[PDB]
Design an enzyme around this catalytic site. Structure first.
Site, PDB file in Angstrom:
ATOM      1  N   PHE C  32     -23.954 -34.252 -30.347  1.00  0.00           N
ATOM      2  CA  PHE C  32     -23.710 -35.163 -31.463  1.00  0.00           C
ATOM      3  C   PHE C  32     -22.325 -35.787 -31.330  1.00  0.00           C
ATOM      4  O   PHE C  32     -21.384 -35.086 -30.958  1.00  0.00           O
ATOM      5  CB  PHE C  32     -23.820 -34.400 -32.781  1.00  0.00           C
ATOM      6  N   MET C  99     -25.189 -30.060 -29.575  1.00  0.00           N
ATOM      7  CA  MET C  99     -26.552 -30.120 -30.115  1.00  0.00           C
ATOM      8  C   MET C  99     -27.704 -29.911 -29.126  1.00  0.00           C
ATOM      9  O   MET C  99     -28.713 -29.300 -29.475  1.00  0.00           O
ATOM     10  CB  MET C  99     -26.768 -31.413 -30.900  1.00  0.00           C
ATOM     11  N   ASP C 228     -11.765 -25.052 -27.642  1.00  0.00           N
ATOM     12  CA  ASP C 228     -12.804 -25.786 -28.357  1.00  0.00           C
ATOM     13  C   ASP C 228     -12.567 -25.659 -29.862  1.00  0.00           C
ATOM     14  O   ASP C 228     -12.674 -24.571 -30.427  1.00  0.00           O
ATOM     15  CB  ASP C 228     -14.188 -25.252 -27.981  1.00  0.00           C
ATOM     16  N   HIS C 257     -13.968 -29.419 -27.032  1.00  0.00           N
ATOM     17  CA  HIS C 257     -15.417 -29.566 -27.180  1.00  0.00           C
ATOM     18  C   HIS C 257     -15.951 -30.593 -26.178  1.00  0.00           C
ATOM     19  O   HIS C 257     -16.939 -30.342 -25.493  1.00  0.00           O
ATOM     20  CB  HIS C 257     -15.788 -29.983 -28.607  1.00  0.00           C
TER      21      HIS C 257
END
Lengths: 441, 441, 441
Positions: C32, C99, C228, C257
């Site tokens: 995402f 995701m 992250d 991330h």
């Protein structure tokens, strides 16, 4: 109405038969020299009780064709068989009188009790009428039977009068138990019968039925009149009860050979009772088979023991509040909503009184087939076929050729009273569903 | 997703469109130079409320094809029409913004309000932007519009920046009501649009909509921002409200042209309200039409007046105990069991809360189709077709092609929750049944 | 390019997808709020390595359609499945990011690893992000996720900027590992995505994947960045490695991330290695099966042990001089010339480097099909069918429907480079031949 059994030169051999009422099938096989219409009083009782009454005319009698061949019991049975297989009768009761009792035995012996639930022997030939050395209990010697054959051939019309005197015990019973008019009827009947048959029939009476009695697989009834002049009770029914001790045995006091008419009351009471006990053992075999299929889908656990206990409770005849039962089923944990609905369906059906309760939401939703038009289209098709069926097995077999969604939908269809089938067929349906769900686990 | 509207040389002209949610259809028509994706905030509100939201990209914008012809409102409407007729939308609401308001008007004028329930005019062009002698209230002269066309052709990319400044009132609202990022989005959108379209579009803005306003048949909403720099409220919305006094009128205080984003809240509240009033007048027209068909089968008498009174009671929103109502229906004299069941069906459906009551025996039996497999086979077929329908009239029409036994069975099917359709379709079904029974009397 | 996955009102739901290169299929599933185009650096690495790279856009993102339904992982997987079954991918690797890792799990759990060779989890959601009582290791409470949903709905455009800051660690990495331009790209991507999807997506992030991790049948890779910020390594990857100890585990030091872009090098090296080890274990399962069929035709003896030893040698990766090997095969006693040629064929194929040697006379003659035009006509027909196949089993099955002369001829056809098939298909061919010769003995 007729059923074709064989052939004679250029003509077909046809047996006259009657089919009345609805329910468990009962076959009545008349005695010499009368027809299916002699049973009239018994029939009447059997129809009010809720049984399917089939009657037919043995070859060479009544309104059946009048050939000049096959006057023996291997043929008479082959006749009866044809009747049974033509109508595809299941779970049937055979009831024979005088000559009729011979068919019953020989049929049972040769062809087996696959279709037969029970039998009844009224005023029986059995075991073996002929008096020889190896049968001392026989009723008369070979010369006595040759004498009757001669008596008929000479003048059957005149012979009937004298036969019916001993048949009904007219010196006792005339004006009292049987009317002059009733005797006149019986005579016309005998007179309408075939001339050859009349003479050929007495020769079959001394048929040896001893090798046939051990085959009798099912529950039986033996019945005889103690004042029977035509067939002495001492040489038939009593020695017949020695050969078959299992049989239920009833002696009617002071009754003649023609005890169907004269002693209709005592015959019916006994008969219906014997049919009522064999109909509450073919209802408990349906119920316990139903139970095994119903329990095949439930998971092993303490819940399966309460469910089974209740099934047996309602199956035995203990009026349980359906409202409490349903509310109990509804709130159960572990059980799948499909399972509860089947159970729901079963209980409402088998419970003696519904007490005017409505249909349960949880069952309706369980048995709706997910609201899929295809499942419901097939349910309608199956439903159509289930109207035509009359047996549990005949219903279950056709039900197993459809999918589990359509079966559920069909059940819900019946549950919702959108259609209606007989109780036994319904069981077949639900049982068929119980087998389709139990085979995917 | 696309809809083909015409042809250009060897390529087809295709309009990009979006179709989301379920319910009463609402069509959103964007303004210059953005796309269907500009409505996003309104859409979001409309989906949660329970409306069907259709959005599309006018030719030469967004993701639609980019031709060099048909840049006029007789074409833009012919476009919209094609959209409407392709999707066979019924009882639809048209909502136009800036340029979109032109389509709404011209469509309504030319093609009629057969399909249209209502309209809404947000930041309207109307009535006529051009300042001449016979239109003194016009916003600007012919030379001002020729100046914009020149400005775009020179450099549309640069022009957009300056356009969006006046569009959103960025010297007021930047960082406050609209983000820098949101403006960047709007720019990319304009930039993705067709170069010819960009220049051809401003020429359509001074279209004369005066001959179109008297055609507006349905309930309308006019909405405008008082701080609107692009379209002065004094030369558009206010004079638009003089020409159409019937319209509901809302002024949003201190709002720019781009009031969709900046003042989403005030726009939505007003919009949904206008949709809620037009959705409780298209629900009362369904209910009163339903009532007329339901009353067409009942015999004239004092019973028809109590029945009608109750229908109107439950139709207006007065929570009546379904249990008492059903028990009242059940015990009524004169009414046919078929009639009671239909009524039964109607009431359970229209009553606000069922309160967890079960389905009534008397209704189930009434609507079972006599337990005839053929009627139920047809009911399943009709049921399948009723899943696909979305309107009352579309449902009733297909229902009228079947027999009265199948319709009843189909009703019972739905009543028994063996299937499920939308409320309006169901009405169509029952109404179709009410017409089939009323035509045999 | 598109694949249709479902339906929304009057429009079809279509997923955008890309298919590049040739070889073992690898599926990349983005995070995402980006698309398939975010993988670009990984893809580039995967293509040069010799893998088939499939990428697609999850519903409501990139260039896929933008519906307002099915925003849950049972749907996202059903999507992925459709993709997999449409392209009939075999022996595929699933690689998910952010995701994407959810699909991988849920797919694997529900649909089984029939088609799947391996999986990889980069920056994983797993096992369960939500912080409750029965999940203490969860990353955040229910109120934190409701806060993100609110943040997007308010202004997704502005929200993206702030999301991408934490996503990439921009206060560390801006100008260093990721360019200002690369961030601008990622923003546009997010902005092009569907408004409803943007808001609906965060609600899926706290899906419970604990019941799914025990299903993971195949070799796996878990990868995560220690810096992250979006998905804390302590609440995801580390506790994910406890639930699945079998997995290969790699921590990238100081990575955010968005480690796909920033730390492309460390991601690729690890990824390719995991693909190389899983491609030399699905090649050793093919090789050992190949070995069993090859040994099925050789006579038991000390010669079968040297032959097997060499097969295993060349199968494990020990560069053996093909020239010596062939010369060894050629001069062997006992072996049939048919057998030697098959072996010859196998070795030249499986040997790592041919070293620019020519084709052997003895093999050519062995695999010529006796110079019979019919065998060669059938070999051409089989050859045509072997071009279309991609699997070993799919090749062997069609090969078994021809005669032993045609198979040999087809082999020789391929040996002589008169045609060309993939390595695995070829094995199928020769193995099919080895079974046809072993079944006549």
């Amino acid at each position: 109405p007729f059923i074709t059994v064989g052939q004679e030169n250029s003509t077909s051999i046809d047996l006259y038969y009657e089919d009345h009422g609805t329910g468990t099938p009962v076959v009545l096989i008349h005695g010499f020299p009368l027809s299916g219409h002699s049973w009239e009083r018994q029939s009447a009782a059997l129809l009010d009780a809720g049984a399917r009454v089939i009657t037919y005319d043995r070859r060479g009698f009544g309104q059946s064709s009048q050939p000049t061949t096959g006057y023996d019991y291997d043929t008479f049975a082959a006749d009866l068989n044809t009747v049974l297989e033509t109508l595809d009768l299941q779970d049937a009761v055979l009831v024979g009188f005088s000559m009729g009792t011979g068919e019953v035995a020989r049929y049972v012996s040769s062809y087996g009790t696959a279709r037969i639930a029970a039998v009844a022997f009224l005023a029986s030939l059995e075991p073996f009428l002929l008096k020889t050395d190896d049968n001392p209990d026989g009723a008369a010697p070979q010369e006595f039977f040759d004498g009757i054959v001669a008596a008929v051939k000479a003048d059957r019309y005149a012979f009937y009068t004298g036969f019916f005197n001993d048949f009904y015990n007219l010196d006792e019973n005339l004006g009292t138990r049987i009317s002059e008019e009733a005797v006149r009827n019986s005579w016309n009947t005998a007179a309408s019968g075939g001339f050859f048959a009349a003479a050929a029939a007495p020769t079959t009476w001394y048929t040896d039925f001893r090798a046939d009695i051990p085959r009798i697989d099912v529950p039986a009834l033996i019945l005889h009149g103690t004042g029977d002049r035509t067939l002495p009770i001492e040489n038939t029914a009593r020695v017949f009860h020695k050969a078959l001790p299992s049989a239920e045995y009833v002696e009617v006091e002071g009754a003649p050979h023609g005890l169907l008419w004269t002693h209709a009351e005592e015959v019916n009471t006994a008969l219906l009772a014997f049919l009522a006990k064999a109909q509450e053992a073919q209802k408990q075999k349906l119920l316990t088979e139903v139970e095994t299929y119903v329990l095949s889908i439930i998971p092993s656990g303490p819940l399966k023991a309460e469910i089974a206990q209740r099934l047996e409770d309602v199956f035995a005849g203990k009026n349980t509040d359906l409202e409490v039962l349903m509310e109990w089923l509804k709130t159960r944990p572990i059980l799948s909503p499909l399972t509860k609905g089947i159970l729901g369906f079963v209980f409402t059906l088998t419970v003696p009184s519904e007490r005017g309760l409505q249909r349960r939401r949880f069952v309706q939703n369980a048995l709706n087939g997910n609201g899929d038009p295809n499942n419901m289209d097939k349910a309608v098709k199956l439903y159509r076929k289930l109207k035509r069926e009359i047996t549990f097995h005949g219903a279950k077999e056709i039900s197993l050729s459809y999918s589990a969604g359509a079966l559920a939908s069909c059940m819900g269809l019946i549950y919702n009273r959108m259609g209606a089938v007989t109780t036994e067929v319904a069981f077949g349906l639900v049982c068929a569903t119980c087998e389709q769900i139990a085979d995917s686990q």
